[PDB]
């Protein structure tokens, strides 16, 4: 076939049921998916392929960099709730893996200040129980695929993308098969 198992893809041999359709793990730690984030935009290219009718998670993940690993996951969570991903995605991204001026949770704090959520908002967020519930989904769904690296892309619960086994001497073209695969991977 032209899209074969164990080539551009993998398949769980434990299904997940009731798994987001399109399902993405990142941390800001992770140096590919500062390229997938920073330089690809594989999220973007993604969904610009998609069929309607297809919803998009994506999910930080608390395996690296330790308790500022968890404290991102928890700002990620914050973002989820306050719906300003596209906004601090990249200084979170930059702050951690450029200037690297992210240290501590207050200095996560201070890019949502600088993108322009306000103080009391952010904490009020950040202490909210609806961004602990957010959490434990984060957790949850790595968990229920046994998540050990990212960036990671799972699709119905059922297949895994394998980016290894595609083409990257030119970016471009790596992310058109990445996301034509995402698409065939959706409609099978």
């Known amino acids: 076939a032209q899209y074969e198992d164990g080539k ?3 398949t769980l041999e434990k299904p997940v049921a009731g798994a987001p359709q399109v399902l993405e793990f990142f941390s800001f730690f992770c140096p590919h998916c500062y390229q997938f984030e920073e330089v690809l935009h594989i999220s973007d290219n993604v969904k610009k392929k998609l069929p309607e009718g297809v919803k998009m998670t994506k999910y930080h993940v608390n395996f690296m960099g330790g308790d500022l690993g968890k404290d991102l ?7 989820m709730a306050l719906g300003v991903e596209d906004k601090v995605t990249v200084p979170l991204f930059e702050g951690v893996q450029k200037t690297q001026t992210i240290r501590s949770a207050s200095d996560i704090r201070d890019v949502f200040i600088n993108a322009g959520i306000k103080g009391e908002e952010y904490d009020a967020a950040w202490n909210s129980f609806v961004v602990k519930s ?3 989904q984060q957790e949850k769904a790595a968990a229920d695929v046994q998540l050990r690296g990212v960036p990671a892309m799972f699709v119905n619960g059922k297949y895994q993308l394998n980016p290894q086994g595609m083409d990257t001497s030119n970016m471009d073209v790596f992310v058109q098969q990445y996301a034509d695969t995402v698409k065939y991977l959706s409609e099978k």
């Open 8 to 10: 551009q893809y993998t």
């Open 73 to 79: 996951t928890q700002a990620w969570a914050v973002a």
């Open 134 to 136: 957010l959490v434990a």
